[PDB]
Amino acid sequence: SHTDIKVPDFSDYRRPEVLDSTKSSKESSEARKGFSYLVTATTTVGVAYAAKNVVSQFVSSMSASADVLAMSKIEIKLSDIPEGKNMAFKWRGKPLFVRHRTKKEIDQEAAVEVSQLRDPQHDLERVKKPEWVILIGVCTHLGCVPIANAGDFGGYYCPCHGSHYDASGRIRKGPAPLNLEVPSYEFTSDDMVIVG
Amino acid sequence: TNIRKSHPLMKIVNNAFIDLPAPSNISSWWNFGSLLGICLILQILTGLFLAMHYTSDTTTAFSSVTHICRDVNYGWIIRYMHANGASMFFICLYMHVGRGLYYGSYTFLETWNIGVILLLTVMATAFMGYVLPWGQMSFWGATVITNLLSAIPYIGTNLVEWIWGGFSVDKATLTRFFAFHFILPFIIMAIAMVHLLFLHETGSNNPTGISSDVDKIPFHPYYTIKDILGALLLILALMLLVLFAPDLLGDPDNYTPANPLNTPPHIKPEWYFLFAYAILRSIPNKLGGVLALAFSILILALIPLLHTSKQRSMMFRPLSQCLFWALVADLLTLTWIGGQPVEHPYITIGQLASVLYFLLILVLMPTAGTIENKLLKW
Amino acid sequence: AVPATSESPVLDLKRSVLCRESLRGQAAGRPLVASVSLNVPASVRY
Amino acid sequence: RWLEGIRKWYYNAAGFNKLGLMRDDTIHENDDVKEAIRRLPENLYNDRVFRIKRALDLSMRQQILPKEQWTKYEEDKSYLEPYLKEVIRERKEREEWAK
Amino acid sequence: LVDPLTTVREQCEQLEKCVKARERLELCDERVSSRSQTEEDCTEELLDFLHARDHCVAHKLFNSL
Amino acid sequence: APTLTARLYSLLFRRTSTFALTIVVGALFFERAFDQGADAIYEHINEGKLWKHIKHKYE
Amino acid sequence: ATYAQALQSVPETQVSQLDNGLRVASEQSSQPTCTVGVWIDAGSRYESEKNNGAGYFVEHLAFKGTKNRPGNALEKEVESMGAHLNAYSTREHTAYYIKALSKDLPKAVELLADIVQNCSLEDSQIEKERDVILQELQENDTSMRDVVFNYLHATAFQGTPLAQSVEGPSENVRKLSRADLTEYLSRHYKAPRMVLAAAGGLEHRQLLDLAQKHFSGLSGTYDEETVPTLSPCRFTGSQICHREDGLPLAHVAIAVEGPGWAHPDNVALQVANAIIGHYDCTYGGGAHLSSPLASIAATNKLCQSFQTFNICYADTGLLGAHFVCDHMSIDDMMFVLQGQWMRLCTSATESEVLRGKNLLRNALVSHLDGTTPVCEDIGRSLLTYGRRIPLAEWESRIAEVDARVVREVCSKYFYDQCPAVAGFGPIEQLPDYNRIRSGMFWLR
Amino acid sequence: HPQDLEFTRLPNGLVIASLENYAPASRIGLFIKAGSRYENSNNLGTSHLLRLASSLTTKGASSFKITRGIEAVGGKLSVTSTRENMAYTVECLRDDVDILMEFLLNVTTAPEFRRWEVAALQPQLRIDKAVALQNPQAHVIENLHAAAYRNALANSLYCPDYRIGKVTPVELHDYVQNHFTSARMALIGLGVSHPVLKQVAEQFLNIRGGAKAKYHGGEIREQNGDSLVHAALVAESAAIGSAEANAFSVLQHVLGAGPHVKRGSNATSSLYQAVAKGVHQPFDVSAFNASYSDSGLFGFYTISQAASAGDVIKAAYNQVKTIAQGNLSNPDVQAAKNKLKAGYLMSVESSEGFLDEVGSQALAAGSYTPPSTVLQQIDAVADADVINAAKKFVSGRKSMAASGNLGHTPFIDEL
Amino acid sequence: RQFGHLTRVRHVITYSLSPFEQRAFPHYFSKGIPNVLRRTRACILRVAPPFVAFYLVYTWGTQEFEKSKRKNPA
Amino acid sequence: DLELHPPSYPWSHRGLLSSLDHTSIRRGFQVYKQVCSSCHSMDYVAYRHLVGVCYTEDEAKALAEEVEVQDGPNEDGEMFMRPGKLSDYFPKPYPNPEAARAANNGALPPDLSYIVRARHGGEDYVFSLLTGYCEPPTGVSLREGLYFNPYFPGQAIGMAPPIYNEVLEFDDGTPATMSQVAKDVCTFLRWAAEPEHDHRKRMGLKMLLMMGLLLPLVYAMKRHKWSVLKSRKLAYRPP
């Protein structure tokens, strides 16, 4: 008969908790699952730690390399530029105009008409310190290098098409759409400035 | 009823990777297929990320690779993963092939032949990869190996200058080697899918060489969990090299830029070609040497035809077992000899090893099969 | 709502009889009845 | 006759007996063997099925049987010979007739 | 100023493996410099000596640094 | 009281939603613990050799 | 005249006890016919390995004569008064009962008493009934249903008395002497282990007095060593796979550990099992069936038949399902069945639980129809619960079950728990245990 | 409030009977003279399809609603066929009777039998027949009738193979419209008030109205190679409702009509002992008694070993001959009466079987005969009546049917 | 080819336990160590001899290359 | 053409998880600066590379400012010379290789950026070369200017011994012996060829620990799932 089949002894293989044939396995069920799922959960935390680092590195690869960060910023010495004169610099393959402004140039660009401008910006929001104006020396229309201390509005003038910038770098009379660009910067020691 | 068996895309994945009936008894030597796939993906990713920073112009090439290692964020760990990943690839390949030989998996003819194609494509990829850094061994390795094709009569000399795109390995050669090197892994991926497509016509062989239809288990969870463990161990081997000895399996001469005047002392390809490089140098005649180097790989295509034994696996076959392990030890000797200068006693050892390689495959292991048969009254 | 005396399959190999003790009760004594249902398995009676 | 010493050695060296297999279980399945298997009677087929199942399960564990249970060289009946011999003999007839 | 290197090179020079190799060096010194017109030199014997010497030097030079 | 593993199962591992939130939380706590703990092991092994240890001499 | 009301005026069950400890229980109504019998806490669970199948062997000998009525005299007397004599043995309960005319109840009770106490157990009759059992054991091998259930127990409660079949192994059948049978009887057939149950036209007072007259001699003490006390039984998450391709349909039986007789949860589990329900190929419903398992099974011809079960033993049980299907359908059957268990655990609805309630209400109200099932309900309820539970109380337990209960109760027993699997026949497809065990939880 | 049965026959022919017993459950049965006998040779197996066809779409309720709606309230719908009647039955808790009643009326008074639904149902004829014919008793009894009759009662309950896939919607409509009529219907109930049943029957079961069974005597022989041979041999008995019928029922229990004890040796069964005297290998024998409006069949059914079929059948037939010659004492006829008396009361013990007897009587006779009157009619059978029944069988024209390896099974004219 | 259409098998019973009922490493050292040694002994003199030979042909050839590069006393 | 390969010196960074001695790098840089940088280029190391390794940001700015470098063009279209910054690389001695050959009698001094990686033996090799200059053995002499070194291939090199006792004073006041000067410059050249060294090894430790955790866990998960099959018993029970 099929009644002759009796299941082999599995005692060699069993967990200690389920060895006792006279006791209910239900006591140990909460526990036995706990142990095995802990192993699984711990594993997943370890794999997460790894994959986070692997992915994160690969992502980092695509961000700016050490040599591109090296040309990100440029230091400029403020005692090396006299009051009134412009000084050009080489920044991210562009000219960069820093200008020491006189108490005349400050007051004269302070009380200018706000509305009349093609790109309306007041002077106290174009600069961080009133006596220093920092600008990119690329003409905004079709890309030239504006010449300092010239033009109608006495600031920057371009011999390409016919643009006239004031002492604050704002377009007054010409074909340029948006003023000369104000970069990101901060003064560190009152003698030095970092642009970038 | 489920959307694993119903959905046109999930159906393919459910049948190849989950409900696939696999033999209960397959050993660790069956992990290498899984691992070769991982190697391939690994190379593609690391490779693609390197290609974002590399340039194939002869002047800037060496510099770009170093720029990766020194300035690109974690560019070093990417670069050395890719170079040691190529070693891990070839380790995985030869283990994978050895399994096939020992257990007679090559009786799956289509699977086997596509294998040979895959092998040859991975070789072509890795040959052209090693050129890209444009160091000494890169340049001089490429020069000697390419120039072997000039030994073909009538056309050989044209053929060499056509690959080169000029009169030596220079500007046009490096740029095209970058192009071919990029595209080939993708071609491999496709051929690898055809490889499996034929494998799943028959299902897997096992260590006994006896049909396993009476004892198949589903691939998931049994072999999905094994493959995870295998992948884990593969990452250990790779990262052990990358983080503790990244220069171990390479050559120093590839850290000085390529010089068309200054020849390196003992020019040689990377370790995984050395066995076949030794076979080339055994034969004194150059065209003979090329035909031997060619036949040292293509002989893989011949193996199925050479099978004599009435049993499939070498499991139950002592004579074959010994001759197999002799063939392995011989290949290890050819790799050693391939790395050496052309002198005594490395010439004679190399000749003797090369004779033994072809002798084992073409004569001794076939005879051994037939001896074994007649010992079993077969 | 109650499942029947015997769950019915088609093409399922028939159950053997080996003795008097299992074979008595089988001999038909009254004419056939047939039920079909919504809930209960279909039966055929003596 | 005299090589029976070596045949007995080789048998044990080969070692399929350690999995409780007979020689004809280890035969590589070509088209003839498939047909020969297909012609086996219920008893011989199911025995084959089990012996292999047992061997595969042992192979899976990387273990062998107890030495008492190993297939004895002398008790290895050649169960597949009569069927396979005829399958081959038949095919050779069709191949002849095809010329 | 005394170099720790030249101290240790002396210390190692008076070992059995060194002194045996140093005598091999001195043999061919006054064999080739005594004989006339033979193109043989003594590079080999020097390198035998240095191999044994500088192996020992390595094992304890770095202590003084 | 039932065993430790049992408390872990009923509170964290039974619902797959709690099991996953457990992993995400634990991975954060593990990451900072492992990183800080392993770095300590490294920097002790290389005491005084790193820029981090000799920084103070030039500041 | 409402349903709630109807339950209040169902005839109550009378309950009295004898000196020796025999319980007498009775349900009365003016009926021309009756059913009366003896239910005993005795079966395969109380048997050891050496005497397994003794209670079954006895069952064969019970109606073969007594000391007072030798040979076929017992048989003749039952037949000539139009009475119908019957017996059954489960793993925990042996039972002998008689269906008779109401006026013949005194003689009916007398005959039952004569069968239990004064059973001949003749030498020649033993050797004759020996071969009979061996042939029944052979018939049983041909019933795939019987085989798969015997297997379920054998693997589920492996290495305990609950693994044992009622009929016993053929080895025991061939060897069990008359010494073994008489020892088995005097140990297990005792007044406090026994209940005399009766239903039909019967004054309870009369039955109790008839019990005195004939069942007074029943032994109700046990000696210094030993008193039958069942140990609990260890459930094991396990599989038994009898692969036999020669048979044309596959039988699969799968279950988790159930709570056993005592537990109130049994009511909510009945409601859940009613939701999933049962099916076969002759059912009128088809696609439009209420049970999603049944409608899916019908429309895709997955199985030929299935039922949910919930089998109760003392401190344990088997809660699950059995199905019979084509050799290519086993995987899909398992998938949908386990899918149903998961849906009830996690997301059972009010309206479907209400359906389950309504099925169960109907189930046990119409099952207790006629004197025989009511007599049996009395007999066994007294052994299992210690009392007859009125229909009004069952109804109170049923009304208490809502969607929240069905979820919480099912989750306790089914969700993330190891089942016992038994398969028989062309079971090549029958899912791997790991795939089955992984199918006992959802990732959400 | 102690209750006994109420009864009504409406002027349109329809019978209503109902015992309000205040149980929690309520069974309601609509009994119709629409059994297999009312098929002709052109629409054979129509009643079989009709039996499978409740829960197809009706006018007032969809196919979906019949199934879901009944299951919603835990209920059951059954359809039961004899040769002479069809019986549509509904059960539920008493609060849902008017829901189930609505469904019952829809099924029986207004089925649509849609072409696509009826066509879809055709394979179910094969499944249902296949299952049923796994019982070898079904082979033999269906053949026995086919052998014994020329037309009406000869019809099988199950659709002949050739007609499966071919029972048309028109035929189903025709069958219902011609046979499900007030003049042919009896509406029975437990646990429901008689007044509300009456009013349902007047308002929803008032619809307008719409050959004798010739005994033949033949034999049908299924050769199939089983090691056991099922066989039945009958002669024409009497019609249900005649007093002679009661004599046959008593003769049945004198001879032996199935087992009384589990695993028992049947010491009072005259046939079983007669056969067991000569041949000891595995067997079963019982008296067979069918009884209909036109006719009846009485005889015996053997199950015997293939080689022993000759011996067993002749042994059984000889036992009837000694009863017909006059060998029959009061103690035997008293025992037989006690069996039949007890058997009848036991068959109406459950409220399922009670409903079947109330409805059964309501069709074949005018009204309800109580249990006490039936037992008195059993006692009215004299020893003389039993001997006449036996005598009738012995000299009556015979019908036979067999299935098995029939190599040693005799023919009628070999007996 | 799907499970259910692989092959024909008759009268073979398979008993097995749930992975939660059993231990992951039963007798891991107790039975593991001897089975390793059995497996190592079984293949050693098939596997090893060629690699001994490699070691010898290698160490011979290496120091033969060294000797050959030295001057000969003549 | 016999060959003497270098011995294995016990470096401060020899071990698996041992970092570079960064103070030793700081000294070693000065040995490149004072001694090598007039002969050897080191094109891949810039003044910014020194920051957070051997020098501060401010110290490295000072080192950069000290050196000449060409820049341009200005608006006039001319190439001027300016003081260096962090973004400038270490400047080459000569304008080209052909110029370098002329200054060293034909021999070209190799770039030192990768010298440790580009020569077998690495820092063991270079240290042996720098300290191994000695008097030639009898029977031997090369062309006037090719010196004798036993570690150089072919036994003769065209580099004058470049280091000796007190060839420079170190910033931190370490006694500048020939041995000490070689040890330091090698440690710098190790870092020059492999800046990743210290990070690489940090990663190694964290990988070894993670693998120590994950491998036996994944192995346990494997045995768990497989335990269904490892336990199983088969029985053949024909009719």
Ligand SMILES: Cc1c(-c2ccc(Cc3ccc(OC(F)(F)F)cc3)cc2)n(O)c2ccccc2c1=O
């Ligand atoms: C398909 C199969 C895999 C298998 C191989 C790889 C992967 C993962 C993977 C890795 C890379 C990958 O890339 C690409 F390009 F698509 F190929 C694709 C998949 C999973 C399973 N293993 O392991 C097996 C092991 C034993 C026997 C049969 C198989 C067997 O039949």
